[PDB]
């Protein structure tokens, strides 16, 4: 009966929707509407536990209404997504992590840093940069390609494992 509320955050264009749709539908959607914030639930078995993952794929205007703080605060774990070919997207990770900490009122929120578009040759964020950042935050780092599905399950399932560890602290 276990359910996990997950939220996928990060800059426009990093592949949040492509990652979400790989998990939900098992294919690469090349051009999912860039403006649309939507959610999807999927039943999975992770380490033998049947789970319902209820995933919010964020999008749309930058706004900070009380309603948005309220529903964002119900997230139990967050994927911090950047793209390895886009330094600006990596530089935005700090902001998303701070907004999560702000609404959850905690220094300890389950998160995973996700470096997407790992299939692309035009790398401008080194793996070491991402590892150093994740280490500084105390969280895992997972390299993904929504295009090929590399790492997708690992990113979501690692986030579930982080939530489990948080629950038992
Ligand atoms: C100049 N900007 C500040 C530096 C980085 C840059 C963009 O920042 C930014 N952009 C957004 N959008 C615009 C683009 C990018 C992604 C989506 C949505 N399309 C955000 C939307 N909601 C939230 C948020 C609102 C909230 O009430 C509570 C939150 C809790 C956790 C995480 C996010 C929350 C944000 F922080 C956004 N930040
Ligand atoms: C501009 N928006 C599009 C039209 C509506 C407007 C607001 O959007 C919006 N409002 C809500 N309200 C619930 C509470 C708090 C404020 C109001 C409205 N009463 C959401 C609730 N849950 C989720 C969600 C669903 C889900 O399946 C998985 C989630 C995982 C983590 C966090 C939230 C999740 C959402 F996305 C909500 N979004
Ligand atoms: N090569 C490559 N392209 C990707 C990958 N993920 C997303 N894209 C492309 O990057 C663009 C933005 O993806 P989208 O899922 O809309 O990003 P979002 O704005 O974060 O939801 C689209 O053109 C996608 O096809 C990936 O892992 N590899
Ligand atoms: Mg999207």
How buried is 18 (Cβ within 10 angstroms: 0-12 exposed, 13-18 middle, 19+ buried)? buried
Q: Domains of the chain by range and CATH?
A: 3-168 (3.40.50.300)
Kindly state if the Cβ of 13 falls inside 6 Å of ligand 1. Answer: no
Residue with tokens 């990596």: 90
Q: Which of 99, 101, 102 is the best mutation target for the ligand 1 pocket, counting ligand atoms within 8 Å of the beta carbon and taking the most?
A: 99
Nearby residues of 136 by Cβ (< 8 Å), 6 or more positions away: none
| HSE of 118, CA atoms in CB hemisphere, 13 A | 19
Kindly state if the Cβ of 77 falls inside 6 Å of ligand 2. Answer: no
Tokens for 150? Answer: 């590399």
Of the candidates 78, 132, 85, the residue with the CA atom closest to the CA atom of residue 103: 78
Rounded to an integer, what distance in angstroms lies between the CA atom of residue 90 and that of residue 67? 27
The ligand whose atoms approach the alpha carbon of 38 most closely is: 2
8 A C-beta contact, residue 140 and residue 164: no
Rounded to an integer, what distance in angstroms lies between the CA atom of residue 16 and that of residue 9? 7
Of the candidates 164, 149, 139, the residue with the CA atom closest to the CA atom of residue 2: 164
What is the residue with the minimal CA distance to atom 21 of ligand 2?
71
Q: Which of 71, 79, 99, 163 is the best mutation target for the ligand 2 pocket, counting ligand atoms within 8 Å of the beta carbon and taking the most?
A: 71
Ligand 3 atom closest to the Cα of residue 116 is 27
């Amino acid at each position: 009966m276990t359910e996990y509320k997950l939220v996928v955050v990060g800059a426009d264009g990093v592949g949040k929707s492509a990652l979400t749709i790989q998990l939900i539908q098992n294919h690469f959607v090349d051009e999912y509407d860039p403006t649309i914030e939507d959610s999807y639930r999927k039943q999975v078995v992770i380490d033998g536990e049947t789970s319902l993952l209820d995933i919010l794929d964020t999008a749309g205007q930058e706004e900070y209404s009380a309603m948005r703080d309220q529903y964002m605060r119900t997230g139990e774990g967050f994927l911090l997504v950047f793209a390895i070919n886009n330094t600006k997207s990596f530089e935005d990770i700090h902001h998303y992590r701070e907004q999560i900490k702000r609404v959850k009122d905690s220094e300890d929120v389950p998160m995973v840093l996700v470096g997407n578009k790992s299939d692309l040759p035009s790398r401008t964020v080194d793996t070491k940069q991402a590892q150093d950042l994740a280490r500084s935050y105390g969280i895992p780092f997972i390299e993904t390609s929504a295009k090929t599905r590399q790492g997708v399950d690992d990113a979501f399932y690692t986030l579930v494992r982080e939530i489990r560890k948080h629950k038992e602290k």
